[PDB]
Amino acid sequence: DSEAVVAVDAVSFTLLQDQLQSVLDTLSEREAGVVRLRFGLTDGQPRTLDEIGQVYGVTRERIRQIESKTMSKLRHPSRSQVLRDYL
Amino acid sequence: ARSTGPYSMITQQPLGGKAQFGGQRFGEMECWAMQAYGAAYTLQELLTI
Amino acid sequence: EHPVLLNRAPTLHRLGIQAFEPMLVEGKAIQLHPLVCEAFNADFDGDQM
Amino acid sequence: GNRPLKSLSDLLKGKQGRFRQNLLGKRVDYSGRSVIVVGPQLKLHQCGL
DNA sequence: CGAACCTGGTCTTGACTCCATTGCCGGATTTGTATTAGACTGGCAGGGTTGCCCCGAAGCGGGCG
DNA sequence: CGCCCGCTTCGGGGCAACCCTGCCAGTCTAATACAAATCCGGCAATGGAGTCAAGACCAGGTTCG
Numbered sequence: 384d385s386e387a388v389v390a391v392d393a394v395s396f397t398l399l400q401d402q403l404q405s406v407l408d409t410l411s412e413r414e415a416g417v418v419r420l421r422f423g424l425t426d427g428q429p430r431t432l433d434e435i436g437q438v439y440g441v442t443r444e445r446i447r448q449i450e451s452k453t454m455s456k457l458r459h460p461s462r463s464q465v466l467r468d469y470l
Numbered sequence: 471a472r473s474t475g476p477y478s479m480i481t482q483q484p485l486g487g488k489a490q491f492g493g494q495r496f497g498e499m500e501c502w503a504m505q506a507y508g509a510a511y512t513l514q515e516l517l518t519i
Numbered sequence: 520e521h522p523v524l525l526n527r528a529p530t531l532h533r534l535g536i537q538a539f540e541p542m543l544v545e546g547k548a549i550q551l552h553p554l555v556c557e558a559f560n561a562d563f564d565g566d567q568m
Numbered sequence: 569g570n571r572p573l574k575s576l577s578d579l580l581k582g583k584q585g586r587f588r589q590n591l592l593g594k595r596v597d598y599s600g601r602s603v604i605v606v607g608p609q610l611k612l613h614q615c616g617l
Numbered sequence: 618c619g620a621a622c623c624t625g626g627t628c629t630t631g632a633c634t635c636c637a638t639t640g641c642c643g644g645a646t647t648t649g650t651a652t653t654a655g656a657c658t659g660g661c662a663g664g665g666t667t668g669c670c671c672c673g674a675a676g677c678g679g680g681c682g
Numbered sequence: 683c684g685c686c687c688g689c690t691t692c693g694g695g696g697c698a699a700c701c702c703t704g705c706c707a708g709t710c711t712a713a714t715a716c717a718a719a720t721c722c723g724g725c726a727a728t729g730g731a732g733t734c735a736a737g738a739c740c741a742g743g744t745t746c747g
């Protein structure tokens with residue numbers, strides 16, 4: 384049954400979620416909120432730049448600046464060695 | 471040997487034979503043997519989870 | 520200190536399943552203690568457990 | 569090929585029904601087999617692996 | 618003790634690009650349905666041999682209103 | 683006269699161990715004619731979503747008077 388639950392990717396995915404929430408908690412709060420809303424990690428609904436700037440009450444260019452700054456922070460390998468093995 | 475491998479289609483048992491992984495058939499007489507010991511939890515293990 | 524079971528089909532009676540403490544052995548054949556051959560009805564003609 | 573078909577009553581009758589084949593005796597995970605050899609230096613509660 | 622700096626971002630504003638997303642709109646293709654006027658008129662066709670057990674069905678000899 | 687029931691036989695379903703080990707089975711009147719549906723290919727309304735350039739804006743760490 385090649386669509387059955389493989390039972391090792393599931394626990395790898397749960398460990399991915401735990402480690403990913405830890406690494407996203409290593410940042411500040413506006414940053415992690417922007418990342419979680421930009422990639423839908425809180426409900427499965429991917430919020431875009433205008434919704435995020437609306438729910439934070441700023442402009443969308445500020446949201447894109449914060450997005451680029453944090454995604455530059457995450458590509459630093461100190462925030463990345465614990466996630467590199469997850470591909 | 472098998473820890474977790476392929477699974478059967480209609481029923482959801484582990485598969486069979488060294489060509490796949492498969493497990494060994496914990497058949498009916500072995501169920502009788504572990505009943506006769508009185509090991510109830512291990513029988514529940516081997517037939518559910 | 521983590522025991523395993525040793526089935527031998529056909530499990531005629533209650534002592535076909537016993538629990539042994541395992542230990543690591545060079546090679547690929549399960550080493551069985553000789554004093555349970557009478558319970559397992561296991562000569563060493565190529566029997567598998 | 570002139571093979572009789574398998575109706576609903578043939579899913580339960582005989583040795584290949586759900587009862588004798590998949591309800592009572594299941595393939596299990598966390599399992600394995602091998603050929604056996606004599607272990608005359610083992611303790612009684614030990615075994616090879 | 619103050620002046621001036623230059624730099625950490627913080628945020629906004631406007632201008633521009635790109636891109637999905639319907640919306641027609643027309644041709645291609647795909648699927649369904651109908652119609653063929655000489656006469657034609659009751660199937661192939663195969664297997665199947667164990668033995669034992671329990672039970673239920675059909676039948677035959679036995680007596681009888 | 684025809685009427686009914688006790689043993690006999692005929693048939694019919696159920697069962698006959700258990701581990702591994704294997705892996706994918708068949709065949710002919712034949713096309714037109716049309717219409718609904720579907721689909722797919724190409725511009726054409728976008729406006730939303732992203733992207734950059736520029737700056738205003740602070741208020742704090744760095745240096746000169």
Ligand SMILES: [Mg+2]
Nearest residue numbers: 562564565566
């Ligand atoms: Mg033997």
